[PDB]
Amino acid sequence: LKTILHSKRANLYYLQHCRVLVNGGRVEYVTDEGRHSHYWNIPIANTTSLLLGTGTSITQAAMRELARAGVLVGFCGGGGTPLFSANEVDVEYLQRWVGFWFDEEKRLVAARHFQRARLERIRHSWLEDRVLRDAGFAVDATALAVAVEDSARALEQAPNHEHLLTEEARLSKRLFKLAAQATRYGEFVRAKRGSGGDPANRFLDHGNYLAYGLAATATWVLGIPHGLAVLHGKTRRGGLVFDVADLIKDSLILPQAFLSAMRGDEEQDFRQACLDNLSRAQALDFMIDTLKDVAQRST
Amino acid sequence: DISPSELKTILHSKRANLYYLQHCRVLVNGGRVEYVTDEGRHSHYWNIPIANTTSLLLGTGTSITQAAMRELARAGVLVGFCGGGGTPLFSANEVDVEVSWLTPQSEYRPTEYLQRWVGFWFDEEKRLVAARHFQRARLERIRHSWLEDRVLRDAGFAVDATALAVAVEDSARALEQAPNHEHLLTEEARLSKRLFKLAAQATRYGEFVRAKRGSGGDPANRFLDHGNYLAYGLAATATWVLGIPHGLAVLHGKTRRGGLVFDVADLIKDSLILPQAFLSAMRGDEEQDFRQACLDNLSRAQALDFMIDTLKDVAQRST
Amino acid sequence: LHSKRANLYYLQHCRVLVNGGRVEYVTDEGRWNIPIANTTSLLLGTGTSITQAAMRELARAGVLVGFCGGGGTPLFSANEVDVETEYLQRWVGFWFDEEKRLVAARHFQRARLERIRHSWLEDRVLRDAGFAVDATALAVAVEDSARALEQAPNHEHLLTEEARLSKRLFKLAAQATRYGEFVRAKRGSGGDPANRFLDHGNYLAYGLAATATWVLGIPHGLAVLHGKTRRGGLVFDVADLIKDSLILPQAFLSAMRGDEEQDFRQACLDNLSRAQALDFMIDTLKDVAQRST
Amino acid sequence: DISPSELKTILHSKRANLYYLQHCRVLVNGGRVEYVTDEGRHSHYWNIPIANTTSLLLGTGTSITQAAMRELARAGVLVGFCGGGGTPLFSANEVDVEVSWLTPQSEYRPTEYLQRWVGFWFDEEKRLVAARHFQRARLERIRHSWLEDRVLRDAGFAVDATALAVAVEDSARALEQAPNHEHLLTEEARLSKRLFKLAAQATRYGEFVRAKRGSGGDPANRFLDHGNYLAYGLAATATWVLGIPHGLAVLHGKTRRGGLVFDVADLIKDSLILPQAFLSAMRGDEEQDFRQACLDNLSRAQALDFMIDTLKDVAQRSTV
Ligand SMILES: [Ca+2]
Ligand SMILES: [Ca+2]
Ligand SMILES: [Mn+2]
Ligand SMILES: [Mn+2]
Ligand SMILES: [Mn+2]
Ligand SMILES: [Mn+2]
Ligand code: NA
Ligand code: NA
């Protein structure tokens, strides 16, 4: 059962299990049993973005007709992640992004706002919205709000990027501990990526991977290159994708990791639970909006 | 000494295969990427060695699947959809789009060249310096390949060497005199026209007239259009592998989308593709013979590596 | 915008569809999330469309769906409400006892009088717009009618008094706006702008009333004040809750300002939205059903 | 004498069109309501004569616009959303919803039938008397149609007349003695099952087995599922035109939302839809051929008029 009628923001559609082709100058979508039931109703304007996921194919004639119409096209894994390969976006956000990015102070302004955005999404999904709680995420509501409020303040006071990052890490650590307790996980230590074998560290690694796919889709639709991070160091590959994934990491991935663990989920149960959370909470939209908002303010 | 990344870049720069496909389906078969043609009853199946491939050009009557895209992206192979007969995929306003490129998005790129690039790119006079630098590099390749390339000589490129030296020397003087981008573009077309003429005479083509937008029917024009796709693919690869978006053109930005691909393809279009278009015409090659001959020359001359070095030099020389 | 408590949403200029497993609504490039639960109601207005796959998902999730004009009126067509937290049994439970029906009717009249007092006097929006009504004459009128309504012994007398209050509000409204002589023209037969705007305004009010009865599952044919044989009777009863408080002054204001049809229309819609008219209609209907037992 | 409103009801009862639409958009084009399919190079545009239409059923791959809803609603045309391939739009627990109906809300209905209806409806025993009444009206349509409709006979419905007459007599008997709604429901399904068998034999279908929830792939089952939508549409129209809410069911209330639609559709399902489903299977009709043949039968037999009279009769009899 659906529970949300989604006010769509970014004009991005996901397709799966169909063949995209052209009949008489018209882009159509075909399955083994004739015309696809939904896809004919995706609007083919220069504001559209198309992601072709599981069991899709496309012909050259369709590609022509989509590119002619200003439709950006990409290929993604199941559920829109990872983002495999995509059309380059014509160079708008890039100009603005570059406009502030070389001013280290404006970069910190961007980084501070990302953290505020991230703090709010934690507050929202762990407390205000009930779904996680309903599914057994029994977090100490009181200790959570303290954590957010302390960190928020501690973040506001960091004088520079190095300090912001330190505080940013401390908050994540605090959340792991609360999440573990919430779910009676017992001892938890975050293992640096790939190196932990326990279910939670695993689900966290896999979850972050699904989120990087959504973040990459956000930077791609906006024409913003991965190498212009606001929080991660300037030499980190994929740096901005990670900044962008960090927006919903602790609010959506973190709690489902400990839940799947608590519940004895296998890898695919976790992946699917995760995608459903990202979907319901409109994560991709938020990543996009955060990016626009930051660019808009910069100058 | 060298990073593992830089090693991988060198290794990528040595991939020799570049496919141009028509009337086939690109898909995955027993975990291999393959293209499939319909031979009436037969279907023929052709392997694609992805670790050795820089790009796929997919023209008329092609399709590709998401599972192939997955495998291709993961191996860092670009996929471009192009039009038929060397004509544009489509034309919108006054701009022709030869290839729609799909570039891998999850194989994270280095950041340093991108940062240098967006560092100069919004400054018009610094784009001028970058444009000029590409043009200089282009002239040095024309000289080397037209004058010191025994392999081209031995294949029947009986070019008037004195005349080639004179045109290239005049172009250099003009290039360095150019006040702006319009002057660069003007000089470039002017060299190209002299070179087509010289190549025509070298190969007994008879009187040659360059036809635009893939409109020419004659062997030379067709081979020149087909060969440019090869240069576009290497250029699309060279910029992708360094993390530079195709859109940040410094010379062709007014008349081409993803114009950096054209800027970079110009490094080898006149030096390498052009002679071989006339050599193939002269000998009666079919298109795919000509394509193989180019790939051989581009591998031999280490074209991809040159393109990548030049991008680096251009990026470094705005610091 | 979808303004009306956690439960009724209004959409316009968008396509409702299913993509990537979600029910989504896609706004026109020219122009908040909605919860899909069994308590949701959804109205699709100007420049909307919906696919069968979306309808499926909303129906499955217990969302009642309707189509309506600009701003939520008229109500064109809607899902049948499941007969049951159900007002229908209660409604019918009192409706056949004529004395209980009068109790309902008396409550509607008190509710309507309070709305008039609120909007004409207490609340100043109307005032600010140039509705310069004699505050004193208005309070006398309301108090007198209230008293006269409580004194009426049956529906007939209640209806008589009810019309006599409307007549005296028209006159107060005309003077408030320096309109000059006014006489209510019955049945769309009036040509002067106040008469025309009152006709149009009531039509917009019917649209809202129809929505209120639809959400509660109550049939139009069970009126508490209008005659048993009158088609759309309960809708007219419900519209009467806000006719004189909101539509009547806007009609004289629009005429005074030289408004065209659409100015008037948009002014009502805004008044109706500002004053939360639809919620009042619904609350009143719920309360009458509650106080009927 | 005859009121303009009742004349309008008689006029509405004669509307002959009923559309079942798939893979198209319903919209307004030059002031007309039309449906549009995409045919590669050319879109096809099909007019909907709204004054001559009872309902639209919109299945797989449809959409409709507010502007179309406005024109349809104004003309008193119902719009239902149905599922694919004769299967339910959806199922929520033990209850299947075949069609989600949108009914016009600004074309004010008469009040008298509704008032009679809510007057008896909350009394179970009165609902029972209403259910029996519907069931007798159904037996009478079955008799008239299977025994006296020469048109069906000439189309090759070679039914065993005596076998049919005997089953309907047994049914009437069992009907009158039904103590509960439970008993009525049991007898209803027992008669329908005899009728499938008789229709199958009249049309050389071979052994027939009714499949539920649209799950049957054989022609008869598919036409039965398809024909039911037509009956639902006319029932939805009959009840709406009289101002009776779909939910005030007297028979199928336990298993069906908007159950009165089913109770009313039962007046013509076995009498008309059922033989035609077997005739179409016998001839090799495509689905749209079958649907047209039904519409022709329903119009010739004045099915909508009968449903409407029956609801009126039932409402008027509750009143004693
Ligand atoms: Ca090198
Ligand atoms: Ca009759
Ligand atoms: Mn980090
Ligand atoms: Mn050039
Ligand atoms: Mn009245
Ligand atoms: Mn039945
Ligand atoms: Na050509
Ligand atoms: Na079926």
Distance D266 CA to ligand 6 centre (A): 6
Q: Between B287-300 and B219-242, two packed helices, what is the crossing angle to 10 degrees?
A: 40
Count CB neighbours of A120 within 10 A. 16
Give the contacts of D120 (CB within 8 A, at least 6 positions apart): D126, D127, D130, D318, D319
| Ligand index nearest the alpha carbon of residue A241 | 3
Alpha carbons A258 and A187: distance in angstroms, whole number: 12
Please answer yes or no on whether A43 and C18 come within 8 Å at the CB atom.
Answer: no
Q: Which helix (H) or strand (E) holds D169?
A: helix D161-176
| Ligand index nearest the alpha carbon of residue D184 | 6
C157 has binding-site annotation: no
Alpha carbons B117 and D188: distance in angstroms, whole number: 80
Radius of gyration of chain B (CA): 19
Quick check: A224 and A215 in contact, CB under 8 A? Answer: no
C37 and D CB contact within 8 Å = no
Contacts of A130 in chain C (CB under 8 A): none
Pairing of strands C34-35, A4-7: antiparallel
Residue limits of CATH 1.20.120.920 in chain D: 112-320
Amino acid at B185: L
Please answer yes or no on whether D105 and C214 come within 8 Å at the CB atom.
Answer: yes
Distance D25 CA to ligand 2 centre (A): 35
Residue limits of CATH 3.100.10.20 in chain C: 1-84
Q: Fold for domain C1-84?
A: Ribosomal Protein L15; Chain: K; domain 2 (3.100.10)
A157 and D CB contact within 8 Å = no
Buried b / exposed e over D189-202, threshold 16 CB at 10 Å, is: eebbebbbbbbbbb
Q: Which two tokens stand for residue D1?
A: 């004498």
For chains B and C, having 3+ Cβ pairs within 8 Å is answered no
Q: Which two tokens stand for residue A273?
A: 């639970």
Give the contacts of B168 (CB within 8 A, at least 6 positions apart): B139, B142, B143, B146, B191
Distance D262 CA to ligand 6 centre (A): 6
Quick check: D100 and C61 in contact, CB under 8 A? Answer: no
Residue limits of CATH 3.100.10.20 in chain B: 1-111
Distance C289 CA to ligand 5 centre (A): 21
| Three-class SS of D218-272 | CHHHHHHHHHHHHHHHHHHHHHHHHCCCCCCCCCCCCCCCCHHHHHHHCCCHHHH
- For residue B229, give the nearest of B282, B298, B158, B139 by alpha carbon: B298
Residue limits of CATH 1.20.120.920 in chain A: 92-299
CATH no. for A1-91: 3.100.10.20
D150 and A CB contact within 8 Å = no
Contacts of C235 in chain D (CB under 8 A): 108
Distance B186 CA to ligand 4 centre (A): 10
The Cα angle at residue D173 between residues D168 and D174, in degrees rounded to 5: 95
- What is the four-CA torsion angle of B123, B127, B129, B133, rounded to 10 degrees? 160
How many residues are given for chain A?
299
- For residue C286, give the nearest of C158, C159, C104 by alpha carbon: C104
Q: Quote the longest CA-to-CA distance of chain A.
A: 63
CATH no. for D112-320: 1.20.120.920
Residue where the block lists tokens 């035109």: D241
Q: Which helix (H) or strand (E) holds C198?
A: helix C193-216
C38 and D CB contact within 8 Å = no
Quick check: A111 and A161 in contact, CB under 8 A? Answer: yes
First to last CA, chain D: 25
Alpha carbons B162 and B230: distance in angstroms, whole number: 29
Alpha carbons B210 and B196: distance in angstroms, whole number: 8
Residue where the block lists tokens 């908050």: A171
Please answer yes or no on whether A41 and D63 come within 8 Å at the CB atom.
Answer: yes
A6 and C CB contact within 8 Å = yes
Alpha carbons B160 and D218: distance in angstroms, whole number: 81
Alpha carbons D71 and D74: distance in angstroms, whole number: 5
Sign for the CA dihedral angle at B167, B172, B175, B176 comes to: negative
Count CB neighbours of C134 within 10 A. 13
Alpha carbons C169 and C155: distance in angstroms, whole number: 21
Mutation target among D99, D100, D106 for the C interface, most CBs of C within 10 A: D106
Q: Which two tokens stand for residue A164?
A: 């912001």
Give the contacts of D140 (CB within 8 A, at least 6 positions apart): none
Q: Which two tokens stand for residue D309?
A: 């009279």
| Ligand index nearest the alpha carbon of residue D14 | 2
Sign for the CA dihedral angle at C174, C180, C183, C187 comes to: negative
- Of residues C25, C29, C35, nearest to A8 (C-beta): C25
* Three-state DSSP class for residue B83: coil
Query: Which CATH architecture fits C85-293?
Result: Up-down Bundle (1.20)
Buried b / exposed e over B99-125, threshold 16 CB at 10 Å, is: bbbbbbbbbbbbbbbbbbbbbbbeeee
Quick check: A18 and A40 in contact, CB under 8 A? Answer: no
Count CB neighbours of D41 within 10 A. 9
Quick check: A16 and A78 in contact, CB under 8 A? Answer: yes
Beta bridge mates, B104: A85
Contacts of A25 in chain D (CB under 8 A): 40-41
Sign for the CA dihedral angle at C85, C88, C91, C96 comes to: negative
How many residues are given for chain B?
319
Sign for the CA dihedral angle at C37, C40, C41, C42 comes to: negative
Query: Which CATH architecture fits B112-319?
Result: Up-down Bundle (1.20)
Q: Show binding-site residues of B.
A: 188, 252, 266
C226 has binding-site annotation: yes
Q: Is C122 exposed, middle or buried (0-12, 13-18, 19+ CB in 10 A)?
A: exposed
- What is the four-CA torsion angle of D201, D202, D204, D210, rounded to 10 degrees? -50
Alpha carbons B47 and C72: distance in angstroms, whole number: 61
| Ligand index nearest the alpha carbon of residue B287 | 7
Cα distance from A174 to chain C (closest Cα, Å)?
31
For chains D and B, having 3+ Cβ pairs within 8 Å is answered no
Quick check: A17 and A53 in contact, CB under 8 A? Answer: no
Distance B270 CA to ligand 4 centre (A): 9
Technique used to solve these coordinates? X-ray
Count CB neighbours of C274 within 10 A. 12
Q: Name subunits touching B (3+ CB pairs < 8 A).
A: A
Sign for the CA dihedral angle at B284, B285, B286, B290 comes to: negative
* Three-state DSSP class for residue B64: strand
Radius of gyration of chain A (CA): 20
Buried b / exposed e over B266-281, threshold 16 CB at 10 Å, is: bbbbbbbbbbbbbbbb
C140 and A CB contact within 8 Å = no
**DSSP character for A192?**
P
Q: Which residue in B has a C-alpha nearest to residue A67's C-alpha?
A: B100
CATH no. for D1-111: 3.100.10.20
Residue where the block lists tokens 């007459």: D165
Q: Name subunits touching D (3+ CB pairs < 8 A).
A: A, C
Amino acid at C92: V
Give the contacts of D271 (CB within 8 A, at least 6 positions apart): D138, D141, D142, D144, D145, D146, D301
Helix then strand then coil, in percent of chain B rounded to 5, is 55, 15, 30
Report DSSP letters for B241-264, one per residue. Answer: HHT--TT--SSSTTT-TTHHHHHH
Contacts of A38 in chain D (CB under 8 A): 61
Residue where the block lists tokens 């940040």: B248
C31 and A CB contact within 8 Å = no
Report DSSP letters for A65-114, one per residue. Answer: HHHHTT-EEEEE-TTS-SEEEEEPPP--HHHHHHHHHTSHHHHHHHHHHH
Distance D160 CA to ligand 6 centre (A): 23
Preceding omega of D104 cis (within 30 degrees of 0): no
CATH no. for A92-299: 1.20.120.920
Alpha carbons D25 and D61: distance in angstroms, whole number: 8
Q: Which two tokens stand for residue B24?
A: 């086939």
First to last CA, chain A: 44
Please answer yes or no on whether A75 and B74 come within 8 Å at the CB atom.
Answer: no
- For residue A89, give the nearest of D218, B105, D20, B169 by alpha carbon: B105
B46 and A CB contact within 8 Å = no
| Ligand index nearest the alpha carbon of residue A243 | 3
Q: Which of residues 228-247 of D touch C (CB under 8 A)?
A: 243, 245-247
Give the contacts of D223 (CB within 8 A, at least 6 positions apart): D276, D277, D278, D280, D281, D285, D287, D290
Beta bridge mates, C23: A5, C18
Amino acid at D43: S
Resolution limit, Å = 2.2
Quick check: A31 and A73 in contact, CB under 8 A? Answer: no
Report DSSP letters for B159-225, one per residue. Answer: --HHHHHHHHHHHHHHHHH--SHHHHHHHHHHHHHHHHHHHHHHTT--S----STT---SHHHHHHH
- For residue C53, give the nearest of A226, D64, B57 by alpha carbon: D64
Cα distance from C215 to chain D (closest Cα, Å)?
12
Alpha carbons A86 and A64: distance in angstroms, whole number: 15
Q: Which two tokens stand for residue D284?
A: 């090799």
Residue limits of CATH 1.20.120.920 in chain B: 112-319
A264 and D CB contact within 8 Å = no
- The torsion angles phi and psi of D10, rounded to 5 degrees, stand at -70, -40
How many residues are given for chain D?
320
Quick check: C11 and C25 in contact, CB under 8 A? Answer: yes
Alpha carbons A109 and A158: distance in angstroms, whole number: 12
Pairing of strands B32-39, B24-29: antiparallel
Mutation target among D3, D111, D127, D264 for the C interface, most CBs of C within 10 A: D111
Alpha carbons B159 and B166: distance in angstroms, whole number: 13
Q: Between C and D, how many CB-CB pairs are < 8 A? A: 138
Q: Which helix (H) or strand (E) holds A49?
A: strand A49-52
Cα distance from A132 to chain D (closest Cα, Å)?
24
Please answer yes or no on whether C61 and A279 come within 8 Å at the CB atom.
Answer: no
